[PDB]
Design a protein around this ligand. Structure first.
Ligand SMILES: [Mg+2]
Ligand SMILES: [Mg+2]
Ligand SMILES: [Mg+2]
Ligand SMILES: [Mg+2]
Ligand SMILES: [Mg+2]
Ligand SMILES: [Mg+2]
Ligand SMILES: [Mg+2]
Ligand SMILES: [Mg+2]
Ligand SMILES: [Mg+2]
Ligand SMILES: [Mg+2]
Ligand SMILES: [Mg+2]
Ligand SMILES: [Mg+2]
Ligand SMILES: [Mg+2]
Ligand SMILES: [Mg+2]
Ligand SMILES: [Mg+2]
Ligand SMILES: [Mg+2]
Ligand SMILES: [Mg+2]
Ligand SMILES: [Mg+2]
Ligand SMILES: [Mg+2]
Ligand SMILES: [Mg+2]
Ligand SMILES: [Mg+2]
Ligand SMILES: [Mg+2]
Ligand SMILES: [Mg+2]
Ligand SMILES: [Mg+2]
Ligand SMILES: [Mg+2]
Ligand SMILES: [Mg+2]
Ligand SMILES: [Mg+2]
Ligand SMILES: [Mg+2]
Ligand SMILES: [Mg+2]
Ligand SMILES: [Mg+2]
Ligand SMILES: [Mg+2]
Ligand SMILES: [Mg+2]
Ligand SMILES: [Mg+2]
Ligand SMILES: [Mg+2]
Ligand SMILES: [Mg+2]
Ligand SMILES: [Mg+2]
Ligand SMILES: [Mg+2]
Ligand SMILES: [Mg+2]
Ligand SMILES: [Mg+2]
Ligand SMILES: [Mg+2]
Ligand SMILES: [Mg+2]
Ligand SMILES: [Mg+2]
Ligand SMILES: [Zn+2]
Lengths: 130, 136, 94, 37
RNA sequence: CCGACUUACCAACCCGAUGCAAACUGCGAAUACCGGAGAAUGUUAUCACGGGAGACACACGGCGGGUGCUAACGUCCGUCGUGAAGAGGGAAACAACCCAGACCGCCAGCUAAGGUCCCAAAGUCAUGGUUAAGUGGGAAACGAUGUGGGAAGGCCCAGACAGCCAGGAUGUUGGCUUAGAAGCAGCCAUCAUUUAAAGAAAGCGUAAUAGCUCACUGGUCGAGUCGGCCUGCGCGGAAGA
RNA sequence: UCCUCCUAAAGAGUAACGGAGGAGCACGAAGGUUGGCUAAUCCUGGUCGGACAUCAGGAGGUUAGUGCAAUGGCAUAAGCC
RNA sequence: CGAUGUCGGCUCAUCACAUCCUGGGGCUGAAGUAGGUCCCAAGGGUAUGGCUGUUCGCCAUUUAAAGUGGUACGCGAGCUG
């Protein structure tokens, strides 16, 4: 579908950054639907459907919604990447679940470089409000 | 096999097939098959085309045949000489001129009507084309 | 609004009409009201790609002849017997 | 190799080719569909 | 008796729309035919009478038709041209096709049909495109990513189209025929999660699924791409002593 | 042998073992004149009477009729007394 | 038609391919032998007897195969009747 729908999904992603927080990377070059029922069943464990893995990191798609929100994520653009925003519980445990899940039979996970709360890099952090 | 139930005379002349047609625009259904060439259609070719299109559309929808064989073509017997009178009427033929529509159809999707009329064209001798109804 | 640009027929007749039709054009007539009928020439492709819309025979047409606007409406049309082409269009000034 | 006049595509794995001025039809998964003009 | 009803069916009159007819015209040409006037031209080319014949076996081509197979260098009617009764040039040869009507002679010139590489006299003429089949230099229905174009249309630098990678999703042994029909057999039903998506599968593969896939769905990728239309020319179909 | 239409190419005419039909009569009235009149069909109502005899209206307008086969005509009637 | 001699048979052949065998190949619902269909290919070969005047055809028995047609339904100034 044309501009209306691409731009629609993108702006919808932008609205999820307006009330978002911590985020992380994930790149399942060889993923399975079985893992769909792990991180997303985890989404169901958090609250509901709202969480969007929205794997669409085209430099003119997901990165296109970048100049209006979190421009530091522009360097995350290259290769297969799926951004993971949050909403309930600031700096929640959704981040560590990528690192632990990757070691939990999932081949790979974009080298778990993470995204933006301290504007940092690949850092395994249990240092989250618990 | 279409055939008139009665006629004033049994045998007619040959005439010609010059000029264009009158029933060019689709006026009954939605899609139609329109001749492009010039020739003759018998009472058997039209029946075969109707059967083919009926099988193609699985008897669904409605069809109209706007042509009718009314010219009593005649043939003399085999191994006979010349003269001695005129031959005996054998079959009936409808004269076809370019622009004349042969079949019309309604209540059928266009993608199926195209192949339903292609099947009829593959059995009809003259070349035809697929047309749709238009607003005036 | 469907806008068309037209010419004026200097010569009429079967020969002139056939020359126009072979030169990727076609004649047309505009009549109605109380003024004199006008014989115009129109491009063939530019009208074949416009009449395919159902709005062409229901809405108004803005014809430009000699650098002026004329409001007409489709009243009659003649189509080629076995080709998707046009031969003549009769417009009513309205 | 069936030789006829009308050659066309029967399955989705058929490729129409022209060799030495002759039209041929070859399918990658059905030998029966091999046709020639 | 009278009937009350609907009903896998046919259908009169009329109305609305679409056609056809040599023996149907509420319509109606172009041509042709009768008569009058007028300028010009034609060796009165017109008519009447008288003397003398010859002939009444026609053919072909064009147009208009009947009978034939809308076959015949076939046959039968109307008009015109030619041969008959007409020589010459051209179509390689050719009574009828095209140009053109031989009083005679000339080793004079100008043209029409038709041609200008050689046979064989004339442009290896100029500009502009097409053809790659010797098409030209025998043919159809039909079929094809053959090319030379015209006008549009879809999708597309938030990434199209190909490839190149991951997944194509819970039941469901499906509502079922149940032998088994599991996503792909006839009914169906076609939800519902998870979604980034995905028919409670479009096919091969099947006992049937699995399986291998298809839409798909993400990732990669870096400019077009896909199909219809209108056409110029070309290929197959195309087998004989 | 004779008559009507088409083929018969809008003057006449024009062929085939061409396509469709008729004639070898009749009437002293079925002729002439004068005077008068207009149907075929359908609908409604009415005793025997029925789809259709006869009788009243209405619609219709020559879709009837011509002594005969067809064609061309016929209301001023060529039709009907 | 001021004559082009005719069916069949014997001898004698020749050309063609829409090929009967041999040759090569594709598909096969081609496991193999044996098969079915189609394309190319005419270099060579392509039967003896009973019946009938018969070509044709029926039957017996072979053959790798017992081809299709043209040559004035080949060939009587070669034969036969
Ligand atoms: Mg005619
Ligand atoms: Mg003209
Ligand atoms: Mg080769
Ligand atoms: Mg007529
Ligand atoms: Mg005169
Ligand atoms: Mg005589
Ligand atoms: Mg004579
Ligand atoms: Mg004659
Ligand atoms: Mg002759
Ligand atoms: Mg003729
Ligand atoms: Mg002839
Ligand atoms: Mg000749
Ligand atoms: Mg003769
Ligand atoms: Mg003579
Ligand atoms: Mg001459
Ligand atoms: Mg002369
Ligand atoms: Mg000559
Ligand atoms: Mg010649
Ligand atoms: Mg010569
Ligand atoms: Mg000269
Ligand atoms: Mg010249
Ligand atoms: Mg020379
Ligand atoms: Mg040159
Ligand atoms: Mg060809
Ligand atoms: Mg006449
Ligand atoms: Mg005349
Ligand atoms: Mg009388
Ligand atoms: Mg009177
Ligand atoms: Mg009564
Ligand atoms: Mg009569
Ligand atoms: Mg009288
Ligand atoms: Mg003789
Ligand atoms: Mg002699
Ligand atoms: Mg003799
Ligand atoms: Mg061969
Ligand atoms: Mg050889
Ligand atoms: Mg050799
Ligand atoms: Mg014996
Ligand atoms: Mg012989
Ligand atoms: Mg002999
Ligand atoms: Mg001899
Ligand atoms: Mg004897
Ligand atoms: Zn195949």
């Amino acid at each position: 579908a044309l501009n209306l729908q691409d731009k629609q999904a993108i702006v919808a992603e932008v609205s999820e950054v307006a009330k978002g927080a911590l985020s992380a990377v994930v790149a399942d070059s060889r993923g399975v639907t079985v893992d769909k029922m792990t991180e997303l069943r985890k989404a169901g464990r958090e609250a509901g459907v709202y969480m969007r893995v929205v794997r669409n990191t085209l430099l003119r798609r997901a990165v296109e919604g970048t100049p209006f929100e979190c421009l530091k994520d522009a360097f995350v653009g290259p290769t297969l990447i799926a951004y993971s925003m949050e909403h309930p519980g600031a700096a929640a445990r959704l981040f560590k679940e990528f690192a632990k899940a990757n070691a939990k039979f999932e081949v790979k996970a974009a080298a778990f470089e993470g995204e933006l709360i301290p504007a940092s890099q690949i850092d395994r952090l249990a240092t989250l409000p618990t | 096999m279409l055939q008139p139930k009665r006629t004033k005379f049994r045998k007619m002349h040959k005439g010609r097939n010059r000029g264009l047609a009158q029933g060019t625009d689709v006026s009954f259904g939605s899609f139609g098959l329109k001749a492009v060439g010039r020739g003759r259609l018998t009472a058997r070719q039209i029946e075969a085309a109707r059967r083919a299109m009926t099988r193609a559309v699985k008897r669904q929808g409605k069809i109209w045949i706007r042509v009718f064989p009314d010219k009593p073509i005649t043939e003399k017997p085999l191994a006979v000489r010349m003269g001695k009178g005129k031959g005996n009427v054998e079959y009936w033929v409808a004269l076809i001129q370019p622009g004349k529509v042969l079949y019309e159809m309604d209540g059928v999707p266009e993608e199926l009507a195209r192949e339903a009329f292609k099947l009829a064209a593959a059995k009809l001798p003259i070349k035809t084309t697929f047309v749709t109804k238009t607003v005036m | 609004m469907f806008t068309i640009n037209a010419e004026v027929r200097k010569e009429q007749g079967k020969g002139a009409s056939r020359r126009l039709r072979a030169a990727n054009k076609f004649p047309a007539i505009i009549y109605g009201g109380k003024e004199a009928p006008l014989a115009i020439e129109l491009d063939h492709d530019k009208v074949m790609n416009m009449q395919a819309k159902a709005e062409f025979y229901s809405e108004v047409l803005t014809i430009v002849v000699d650098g002026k606007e004329i409001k007409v409406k489709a009243q009659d049309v003649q189509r080629h017997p076995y080709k998707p082409k046009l031969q003549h269009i009769d417009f009513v000034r309205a | 190799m069936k030789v006829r006049a009308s050659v066309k595509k029967l399955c989705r794995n058929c490729k129409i080719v022209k060799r030495d001025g002759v039209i041929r039809v070859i399918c990658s998964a059905e030998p029966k569909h091999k046709q020639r003009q």
